Amino acid sequence: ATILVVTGTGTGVGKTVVCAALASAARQAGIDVAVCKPVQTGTARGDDDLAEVGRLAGVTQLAGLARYPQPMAPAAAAEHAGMALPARDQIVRLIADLDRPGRLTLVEGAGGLLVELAEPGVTLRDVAVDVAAAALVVVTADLGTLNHTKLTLEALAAQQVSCAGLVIGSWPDPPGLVAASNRSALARIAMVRAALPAGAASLDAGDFAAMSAAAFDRNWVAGLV
């Protein structure tokens, strides 16, 4: 029963595409995969990350909980719809019901690691502690990422949430000086599990699966479960 929380250094760094990529790689290794989005904001703009994982990677086991119309931080999105945040134990139950031996359960947060998912001040990091997940950290290759990554990793070690590694969510072609350097530096901060090529979401079923299996070290993925 392997639970893996998929966080990121920010909003829009590619958490969702990494989830699909990692799900795809794992399924291609015969590993059962469930993906879980406990807090989904922006549904009124049409955002639905579970649907994107499904479309991209063919995952059928998709689990949602809270959905808010506005594209905001959950607390703001909720209060705008006159809705409340889910309870901490509500989020943990969701993940727990998905968890089982042999299965890789991916939990994609909302935005970065310390976004509030439940009141008071409950975040993905607290959730990680409760389900004993490790955390996969999705990062950009852009200027500013080293700080953001170091901050997120520190935040994680602060509650002894293991770090499963880094994934560069979007990797330009060709990479510029700044992108190249940041990769080398990021790799020194932590294990870089993969660097997904820019625009991977434009790929069709096969192209995505092909990309995904190329992207991750097969021994790492096999060894997740």
Ligand X SMILES: Nc1ccn([C@@H]2O[C@H](COP(=O)(O)OP(=O)(O)OP(=O)(O)O)[C@@H](O)[C@H]2O)c(=O)n1
Binding region for its own copies (CB under 8 A) = 10-12, 70-73, 75-76, 79-80, 111-116, 143-144, 146-148, 150-152, 154-155, 158, 177-178, 181-182, 185
Give the 3-state secondary structure of 22-37: HHHHHHCCCCEEEEEE
Strand order across the 2-8 sheet: 61-67, 32-40, 103-108, 2-8, 134-139, 163-171, 192-197
Cα 35 from Cα 206, distance rounded (Å):
20
13 labelled binding-site residue: yes
* From the list its own copies, ligand X, none, partner contacted by residue 177 (C-beta under 5 to 8 A by kind): its own copies
* From the list ligand X, its own copies, none, partner contacted by residue 185 (C-beta under 5 to 8 A by kind): its own copies
Cα 34 from Cα 41, distance rounded (Å):
20
139 labelled binding-site residue: no
Which of residues 123 and 212 has its CB atom nearest to its own copies in the complex? Answer: 123
154 labelled binding-site residue: no
221: exposed, middle or buried (Cβ count in 10 Å: 0-12, 13-18, 19+): buried
Give the position of tokens 């190329």: 214
46 labelled binding-site residue: no
Give the position of tokens 């958490």: 15
Please tell me which residue in 18, 36, 37, 92 is annotated as part of the active site: 37
Judged by CB under 6 A, the residue of 3, 4, 5, 13 near ligand X is 13
Q: Closest approach of Cβ 202 to ligand X, in Å?
A: 6
Which of residues 143 and 214 has its CB atom nearest to its own copies in the complex? Answer: 143
Catalytic positions are 37
